[PDB]
Amino acid sequence: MKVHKGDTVLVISGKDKGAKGKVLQAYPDRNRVLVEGVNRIKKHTATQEAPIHVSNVMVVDSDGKPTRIGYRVDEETGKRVRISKRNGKD
Amino acid sequence: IAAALRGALSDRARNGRIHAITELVEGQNPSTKSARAFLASLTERKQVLVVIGRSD
RNA sequence: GGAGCUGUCAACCGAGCGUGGAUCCGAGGAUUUCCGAAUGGGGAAACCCAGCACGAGUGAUGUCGUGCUACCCGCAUCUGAAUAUAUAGGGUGCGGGAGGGAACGCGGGGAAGUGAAACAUCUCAGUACCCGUAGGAGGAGAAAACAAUUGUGAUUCCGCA
RNA sequence: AGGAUAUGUCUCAGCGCUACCCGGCUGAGAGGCAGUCAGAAAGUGUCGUGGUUAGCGGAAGUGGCCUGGGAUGGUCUGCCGUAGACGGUGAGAGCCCGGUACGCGAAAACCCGGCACCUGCCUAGUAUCAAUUCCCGAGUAGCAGCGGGCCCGUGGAAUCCGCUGUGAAUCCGCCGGGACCACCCGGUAAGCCUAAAUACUCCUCGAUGACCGAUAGCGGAUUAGUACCGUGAGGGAAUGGUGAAAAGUACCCCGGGAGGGGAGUGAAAGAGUACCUGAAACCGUGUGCCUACAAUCCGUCAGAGCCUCCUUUUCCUCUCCGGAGGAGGGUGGUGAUGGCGUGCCUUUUGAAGAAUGAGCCUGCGAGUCAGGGACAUGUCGCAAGGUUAACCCGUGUGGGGUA
RNA sequence: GGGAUGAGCUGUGGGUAGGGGUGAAAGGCCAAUCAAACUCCGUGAUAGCUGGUUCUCCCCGAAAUGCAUUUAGGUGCAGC
RNA sequence: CGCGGCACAUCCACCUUGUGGUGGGUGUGGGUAGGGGAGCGUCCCUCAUUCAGCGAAGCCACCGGGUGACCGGUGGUGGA
Numbered sequence: 001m002k003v004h005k006g007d008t009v010l011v012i013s014g015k016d017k018g019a020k021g022k023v024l025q026a027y028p029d030r031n032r033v034l035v036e037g038v039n040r041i042k043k044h045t046a047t048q049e050a051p052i053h054v055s056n057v058m059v060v061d062s063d064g065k066p067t068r069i070g071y072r073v074d075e076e077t078g079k080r081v082r083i084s085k086r087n088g089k090d
Numbered sequence: 091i092a093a094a095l096r097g098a099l100s101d102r103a104r105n106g107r108i109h110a111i112t113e114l115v116e117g118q119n120p121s122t123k124s125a126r127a128f129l130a131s132l133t134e135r136k137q138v139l140v141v142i143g144r145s146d
Numbered sequence: 147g148g149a150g151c152u153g154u155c156a157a158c159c160g161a162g163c164g165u166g167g168a169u170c171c172g173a174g175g176a177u178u179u180c181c182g183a184a185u186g187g188g189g190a191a192a193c194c195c196a197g198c199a200c201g202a203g204u205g206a207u208g209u210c211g212u213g214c215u216a217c218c219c220g221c222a223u224c225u226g227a228a229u230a231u232a233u234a235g236g237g238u239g240c241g242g243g244a245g246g247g248a249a250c251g252c253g254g255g256g257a258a259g260u261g262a263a264a265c266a267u268c269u270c271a272g273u274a275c276c277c278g279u280a281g282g283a284g285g286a287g288a289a290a291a292c293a294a295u296u297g298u299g300a301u302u303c304c305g306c307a
Numbered sequence: 308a309g310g311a312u313a314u315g316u317c318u319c320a321g322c323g324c325u326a327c328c329c330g331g332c333u334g335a336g337a338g339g340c341a342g343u344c345a346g347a348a349a350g351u352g353u354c355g356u357g358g359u360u361a362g363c364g365g366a367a368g369u370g371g372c373c374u375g376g377g378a379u380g381g382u383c384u385g386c387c388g389u390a391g392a393c394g395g396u397g398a399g400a401g402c403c404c405g406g407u408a409c410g411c412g413a414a415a416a417c418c419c420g421g422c423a424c425c426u427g428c429c430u431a432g433u434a435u436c437a438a439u440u441c442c443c444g445a446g447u448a449g450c451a452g453c454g455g456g457c458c459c460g461u462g463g464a465a466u467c468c469g470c471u472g473u474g475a476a477u478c479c480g481c482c483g484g485g486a487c488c489a490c491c492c493g494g495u496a497a498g499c500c501u502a503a504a505u506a507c508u509c510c511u512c513g514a515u516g517a518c519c520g521a522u523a524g525c526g527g528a529u530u531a532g533u534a535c536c537g538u539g540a541g542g543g544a545a546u547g548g549u550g551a552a553a554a555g556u557a558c559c560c561c562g563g564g565a566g567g568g569g570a571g572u573g574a575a576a577g578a579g580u581a582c583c584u585g586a587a588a589c590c591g592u593g594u595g596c597c598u599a600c601a602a603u604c605c606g607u608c609a610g611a612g613c614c615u616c617c618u619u620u621u622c623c624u625c626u627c628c629g630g631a632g633g634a635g636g637g638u639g640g641u642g643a644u645g646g647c648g649u650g651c652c653u654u655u656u657g658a659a660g661a662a663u664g665a666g667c668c669u670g671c672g673a674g675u676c677a678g679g680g681a682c683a684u685g686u687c688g689c690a691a692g693g694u695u696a697a698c699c700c701g702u703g704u705g706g707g708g709u710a
Numbered sequence: 711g712g713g714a715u716g717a718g719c720u721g722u723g724g725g726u727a728g729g730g731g732u733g734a735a736a737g738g739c740c741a742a743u744c745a746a747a748c749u750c751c752g753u754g755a756u757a758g759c760u761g762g763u764u765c766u767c768c769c770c771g772a773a774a775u776g777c778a779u780u781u782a783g784g785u786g787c788a789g790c
Numbered sequence: 791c792g793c794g795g796c797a798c799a800u801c802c803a804c805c806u807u808g809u810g811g812u813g814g815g816u817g818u819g820g821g822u823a824g825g826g827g828a829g830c831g832u833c834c835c836u837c838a839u840u841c842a843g844c845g846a847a848g849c850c851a852c853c854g855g856g857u858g859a860c861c862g863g864u865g866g867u868g869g870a
């Protein structure tokens with residue numbers, strides 16, 4: 001996916017609309033991610049997070065506002081890279 | 091078949107729904123924005139039949 | 147191709163791998179037990195017992211690994227029984243075949259129910275089925291043809307008639 | 308074919324006995340042409356804006372307010388579009404995601420095409436005359452017997468094919484023109500090869516559906532040719548749905564457990580792994596009326612009395628009350644009692660019939676389709692004319708097409 | 711109750727297959743089926759015979775006779 | 791026979807004076823086989839329009855409606 005484990009994201013839909021966290025783990029097969037401090041869950045002993053759909057998060061461009069992900073043709077050395085739109089650099 | 095088509099076109103023309111244009115986009119490249127602006131200039135109704143040559 | 151992964155029912159774990167490019171996708175190659183046309187011989191398919199040659203192992207028998215060893219047909223060679231010419235046959239060395247596959251093709255064999263308000267000619271129907279044999283298609287195909295007083299000009303398939 | 312008039316792709320060498328004319332043959336070289344083909348067969352290279360087998364990029368809303376668990380809904384606004392195909396995401400998304408329009412992308416293998424290599428073929432016979440001779444596919448044609456098949460069922464039975472017998476001719480020949488004969492016309496059997504237009508789908512990709520939606524659609528959405536049945540060949544099932552997310556109920560109590568109650572999660576547990584919705588038959592529990600002196604196709608008409616809830620009166624006037632009750636009226640439930648009254652279907656002259664079928668509920672289960680078919684009608688177009696079939700061109704349902 | 715040293719009984723292995731087998735013979739038996747087994751296919755066999763055939767209203771409304779019939783419980787034509 | 795509602799056919803007068811309606815007379819309206827005419831309900835598609843998480847479908851109850859098949863309103867349950 002375009003969202004990676006180390007990234008910081010903005011929740012754009014759901015109960016936690018407007019929360020900022022970093023991805024903890026990604027599930028490409030399920031298209032879900034674990035963002036820290038979102039949609040917490042009251043499990044039973046004897047409040048962790050549950051994954052949300054990757055469609056519901058947008059990658060913060062590390063320069064302010066969230067953005068959609070594009071790819072600039074690097075390589076140039078030696079493979080492709082993942083950049084921003086809306087002031088694209090990453 | 092031909093009589094029915096002629097009658098339908100006659101009804102359209104009689105109500106004044108036949109329009110004639112030179113071409114849709116003054117350039118040589120497609121542009122839906124300007125084409126839609128031109129069609130909206132011609133018409134404010136939903137269903138429009140555009141008859142243009144097969145080479146355009 | 148680019149950050150996660152160790153398939154699924156189907157989770158629980160355990161233990162690990164990954165930007166020095168994993169998991170994943172494509173192509174080519176390697177390995178490929180035993181049965182099966184099954185083909186060393188046998189056999190109640192998936193089991194049993196060999197021969198030859200070359201290596202391994204043992205104090206030596208035992209044991210192990212790898213190749214080859216069915217039958218028929220064609221070609222080339224050596225031999226030529228009863229028997230003389232010779233042939234049948236035999237040895238050797240090269241090639242090939244066998245079996246499977248849903249439909250479609252060509253050649254051959256060929257029902258009955260049923261219809262005839264009974265039934266045998268007739269129909270059903272050259273259908274079902276069976277046998278032989280293909281190919282990507284096949285078959286047919288270049289006038290010992292039609293036509294009829296004019297003429298057309300290999301075959302196939304479609305529409306009329 | 309063979310004879311008389313006429314001559315050499317170009318050269319060289321050899322041979323055709325010797326000196327010569329005319330040559331002819333073989334080998335080589337020089338040219339021309341063709342080629343993986345029916346017309347001869349393989350292989351080595353090299354090159355494709357060539358193709359197939361992985362893929363990649365790809366525009367535009369974190370917009371306000373309302374409802375909501377959640378916005379993809381409503382209502383205001385902004386934008387892209389060669390992209391408003393389709394699907395997913397917590398509810399109808401062109402702008403959130405995979406993608407779509409469009410455009411790039413191949414180490415290698417395979418396929419196709421080109422250019423070479425390579426392989427092969429072409430080394431004078433053209434024309435005129437002569438019209439004597441030879442040749443033109445043999446156990447064949449023909450004929451007869453018995454059959455097969457043709458519109459043709461043996462018929463006057465041609466043409467074609469098989470077995471048996473008999474058995475020719477080579478152009479002044481032979482065969483066909485529906486018995487057969489004469490004339491005319493057509494053709495040249497008994498040797499081989501041959502693309503395309505045609506048929507099909509186990510299979511692989513890409514789409515589509517006035518197709519099905521779990522008793523349907525494949526037998527098979529579920530272990531499916533499985534379980535199971537049969538010695539065997541064979542036969543052959545049934546079984547999908549929590550929720551957006553497992554957040555799948557910690558802890559306490561009764562209980563051996565199972566199960567439950569309280570808490571807790573969740574928008575909802577009126578979603579608790581026996582889980583979406585949750586009908587009917589069927590089985591309870593509570594409650595209003597009736598029923599233990601009566602003979603009942605079980606209903607229908609008449610009908611008292613109870614019970615329930617609304618309302619017009621005279622009263623508790625406490626009345627702002629609210630209605631206790633009384634009188635009337637009306638809903639709804641029940642039905643003491645009176646009359647009338649022989650189930651439904653099929654099939655029959657005639658059935659309540661002691662003739663047939665049905666235990667009950669739910670689901671499924673029977674005049675359909677094809678064809679320029681036939682007849683007759685309603686309606687529409689054109690009209691002494693009407694109309695095309697195959698087929699051709701078009702993303703289509705459109706335009707041509709006179710047989 | 712009959713036979714119980716015999717034309718005996720029985721185990722293991724084998725053979726005969728459907729107009730065929732086998733039968734000290736009953737049309738007996740041939741996988742709980744036999745006056746022609748079973749399975750699949752022809753095949754959705756055929757049946758002048760039995761049964762079934764699903765919503766509504768409005769108008770009209772029969773026949774059970776004649777002739778013929780390999781016909782008589784079917785059909786054709788007439789009659790209605 | 792009386793009074794009221796419906797339908798078919800026909801006659802008499804108008805509106806397109808039979809495409810069909812309007813008004814009044816008159817006659818008719820049991821029905822199996824069977825013939826003819828007009829309709830209800832279910833599903834899918836197209837065109838237009840209109841509702842729906844402020845709650846669709848389905849199901850249940852009650853109150854109503856039409857000449858019939860049947861229809862509507864309200865509430866409950868439910869979740870597209």
Ligand SMILES: [Mg+2]
């Ligand atoms: Mg691999």
Ligand SMILES: [Mg+2]
């Ligand atoms: Mg491989």
Ligand SMILES: [Mg+2]
């Ligand atoms: Mg063997």
Ligand SMILES: [Mg+2]
């Ligand atoms: Mg053997």
Ligand SMILES: [Mg+2]
Binds near residue numbers: 226229232
């Ligand atoms: Mg000898």
Ligand SMILES: [Mg+2]
């Ligand atoms: Mg073979």
Ligand SMILES: [Mg+2]
């Ligand atoms: Mg017969």
Ligand SMILES: [Mg+2]
Binds near residue numbers: 262
């Ligand atoms: Mg018969």
Ligand SMILES: [Mg+2]
Binds near residue numbers: 263
């Ligand atoms: Mg019969």
Ligand SMILES: [Mg+2]
């Ligand atoms: Mg082949």
Ligand SMILES: [Mg+2]
């Ligand atoms: Mg061929």
Ligand SMILES: [Mg+2]
């Ligand atoms: Mg992509």
Ligand SMILES: [Mg+2]
Binds near residue numbers: 375
């Ligand atoms: Mg709110």
Ligand SMILES: [Mg+2]
Binds near residue numbers: 379
């Ligand atoms: Mg959606």
Ligand SMILES: [Mg+2]
């Ligand atoms: Mg969509």
Ligand SMILES: [Mg+2]
Binds near residue numbers: 013053056
């Ligand atoms: Mg989303």
